[PDB]
Design a protein around this ligand. Structure first.
Ligand SMILES: *[C@@H]1O[C@H](CO)[C@@H](O[C@@H]2O[C@H](CO)[C@@H](O[C@@H]3O[C@H](CO)[C@@H](O)[C@H](O)[C@@H]3O)[C@H](O)[C@H]2NC(C)=O)[C@H](O)[C@H]1NC(C)=O
Ligand code: NAG
Ligand code: NAG
Ligand code: NAG
Lengths: 473, 115, 101
């Protein structure tokens, strides 16, 4: 039971329940000290520091404080402002640094003692590009909230150079979370295609706005680059006709995945939820999952390095540490199957960019996997039930044809009667009698209706589109 | 919807439903007729003190210096600002209140004075 | 002990020193424009640099005067887009069918 310590820091509420990242951090070490599949002769202790939000100074103090105790590898907090200094300290004293959020990568930082399990936004964005290309859209529209969003989606932003696209940009107001002005601007804009970028809380809180504005109509097809799309309580929506597509790194096919899910729920829904928020309460979150999977990867790396000790490194002693040199190597070399399956590290910059994300969509029953993807082999979408479940083209033997008309004074009239009548029998005129004769001569199953256009249907030179009869046809 | 406020040295004009939200889809022309030699003093009573950072459409209150939709444009106002007071001797103010298909507001309250 | 500081150029070296100074009250000067984090409570810093939330507005003005209907942006490294975001949002109202390389 080799004693060893893991630098743990967590920007924290400074009130209320335990830190989500931190509760995950404890869960993993517990599982470590139960199962002997890992570290039979090793049992891992740890140290907890909690520092303020976005306060690099305060951070560095606690970082050094733990290095006084000595640990194996600090697990820096979720924010750039602190991440950067912690990273600098970790290499300045040679100890590995593990990270869990994408941050702004500094332009030319040469230090080489850190990784970051979160998959890079460049590659994510590239997959987004592929997916958009697959639907072959023309006028997508982007919406972020923090400027840092522009930095992440750059690879999408430059795309107007190569393919044929068109792309505005709008920014959520920083405060008031009130897209009513914004969404109204979108509705008058008629921007059917939306990408989002937001912590999924805002995603849920804005979908309700969209529904209240009545945007929820089968015409729009939302896409949410935020990864934990599966936590979304999509229930009031799955009957509205839209499709939401957002990638899931957390591979849920594994049995162990779900098992750990429910146990996490037992000790996490132990922390009471927020019923308003629109979430499947008591569920994994990508960060929490990642902070978990990181513990195993560090475990693997240490599992072959028994010569580890824990030197009480003094920051103000500016000489580095010793064992990290090959230790960081081992970590970099790791390959693992955790809650998100394959995990690797690109040697070039020590950042994970190789991975297997799983496209999903709003299934009318909920949120279900409808394909996969990777950086290497591009969109591998399983075209199943595209035209037939058997995969052989077939046509419903009985007809279910619909007919759409325009009220025309001699041709199509609403059946004038004080008492109501509905179905495909509420109309009368010339075209109605003609349709009746079509039925009498061929035995149709027609349905009569109007188009919201209610005209001949017209070419839309604003986008080359058509309207009404032409669009529906 | 419109209110004849003619031949009043002063009188009160406001969005219909002034205390509550102004109605939607409303297009009501409001007419100020001042006799010759009279100077028009519009007094506008704002209901809400905050500065909008955006001048957007869907909802506008027009001011015209002479017959509406026809005369030179004075301004198109929106937001939660009270516009500054308007002094013209053109003797005719021709005002329209608009409304969009959703998202109404606190309405507006106005006063006209003639000299 | 001092009464002021003249500080560094990179983003990194900058914000660390800024956090340190505001941790003790000491004023801090800046030159290089950098990325203000949107959720920092810090108070004890200044930066003389003509801030880009204005240069962007002005560049927009100049664009509007020259009346271009097509324009292409060319930057150098990431932080450029942050610096220019007030520009990028332009097509929301006007017509500037622009690209980016
Ligand atoms: C301190 O800085 C803030 C942020 O720059 C100033 O507020 C104003 O913020 C808006 C943000 O869009 C800037 O854009 C302007 O908005 C107005 C109102 O819609 C518009 O009429 C302008 O054409 C422009 O789009 C605005 O420039 C900025 N105002 C400034 C710099 O004076 C805030 O006013 C600044 N305060 C001081 C004391 O300088
Ligand atoms: C959206 O989902 C529904 C149900 O699966 C489907 O019928 C429809 O074709 C999809 N596309 C859109 C955006 O309407
Ligand atoms: C690693 O990073 C380089 C950066 O140039 C990139 O080209 C490459 O695709 C990445 N993936 C791997 C695993 O080589
Ligand atoms: C995806 O990859 C598998 C690999 O077995 C291949 O069989 C399939 O044809 C590919 N394309 C689809 C339809 O997803």
């Amino acid at each position: 039971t080799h004693v060893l310590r893991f630098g743990g820091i967590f920007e924290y509420v400074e009130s209320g329940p335990m830190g989500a990242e931190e509760l995950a951090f404890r869960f993993a070490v517990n599982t470590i000290n139960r199962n002997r599949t890992l570290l039979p002769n090793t049992t891992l202790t740890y140290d907890t520091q909690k520092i303020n939000l976005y306060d690099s100074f305060e951070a560095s103090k606690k970082a050094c404080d733990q290095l006084s105790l000595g640990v194996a590898a600090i697990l820096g907090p979720s924010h750039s402002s602190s991440a950067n200094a912690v990273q600098s300290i970790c290499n300045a004293l040679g100890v590995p640094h593990i990270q869990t959020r994408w941050k702004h990568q500094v332009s030319d930082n040469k230090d080489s003692f850190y990784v970051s399990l979160y998959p890079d936004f460049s590659s994510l964005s590239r997959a987004i590009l592929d997916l958009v290309q697959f639907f072959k859209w023309k006028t997508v529209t982007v919406v972020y909230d923090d400027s840092t969003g522009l930095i992440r989606l750059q690879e999408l932003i430059k795309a107007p150079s190569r393919y044929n696209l068109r792309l505005k940009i709008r920014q959520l107001p920083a405060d008031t979370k009130d897209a009513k002005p914004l969404l109204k601007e979108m509705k008058r804009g008629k921007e059917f295609h939306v990408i989002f970028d937001c912590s999924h809380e805002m995603a849920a809180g804005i979908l309700k706005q969209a529904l209240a504005m009545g945007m929820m109509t089968e015409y729009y097809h939302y896409i949410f680059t935020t990864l934990d799309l599966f936590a979304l309580d999509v229930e009031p929506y799955r009957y509205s006709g839209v499709n939401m597509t957002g990638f899931r790194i957390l591979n849920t096919e594994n049995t162990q995945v779900s098992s750990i899910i429910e146990k996490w729920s037992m000790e996490r829904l132990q922390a009471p939820p927020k019923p308003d928020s629109g979430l499947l309460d008591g569920f994994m979150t990508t960060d929490a999952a990642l902070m978990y999977d990181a513990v195993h990867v560090v475990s693997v790396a240490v599992q072959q390095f028994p010569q580890m000790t824990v030197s009480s490194l003094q920051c103000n002693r500016h000489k580095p540490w010793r064992f990290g040199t090959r230790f960081m190597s081992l970590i970099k070399e790791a390959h693992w199957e955790g809650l998100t399956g394959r995990i690797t590290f690109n040697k070039t910059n020590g950042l994970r960019t190789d991975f297997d994300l799983d496209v999903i969509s709003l299934k009318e029953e909920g949120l279900e996997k409808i394909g996969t993807w990777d950086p290497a082999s591009g969109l591998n979408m399983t075209e199943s039930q595209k035209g037939k479940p058997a995969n052989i083209t077939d046509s419903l033997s009985n007809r279910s044809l619909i007919v759409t008309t325009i009220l025309e004074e001699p041709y199509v009239l609403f059946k004038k009667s004080d008492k109501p009548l509905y179905g495909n029998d509420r109309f009368e005129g010339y075209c109605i009698d003609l349709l009746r004769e079509l039925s009498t001569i061929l035995g149709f199953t027609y349905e009569i209706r109007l188009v919201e256009d209610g005209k001949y249907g017209a070419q839309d030179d604003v986008n080359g589109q058509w309207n009404g009869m032409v669009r529906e046809l | 919807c419109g209110i004849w406020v003619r031949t009043s040295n002063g009188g009160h004009f406001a969005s219909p439903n002034y205390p509550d939200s102004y109605p939607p889809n409303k297009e009501c022309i409001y007419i100020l007729e001042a006799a010759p030699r009279q100077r028009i003093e519009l007094t506008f009573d704002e209901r809400y003190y905050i500065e909008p950072s955006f001048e957007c459409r869907f909802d506008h209150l027009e001011v015209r210096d002479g017959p509406f939709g026809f005369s030179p444009l004075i301004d198109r106002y929106c937001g939660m600002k009270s516009p500054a007071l308007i002094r013209s001797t053109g003797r005719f103010m021709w005002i329209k209140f608009s409304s969009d298909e959703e998202l109404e507001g606190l309405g507006f309250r106005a006063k006209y004075s003639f000299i």
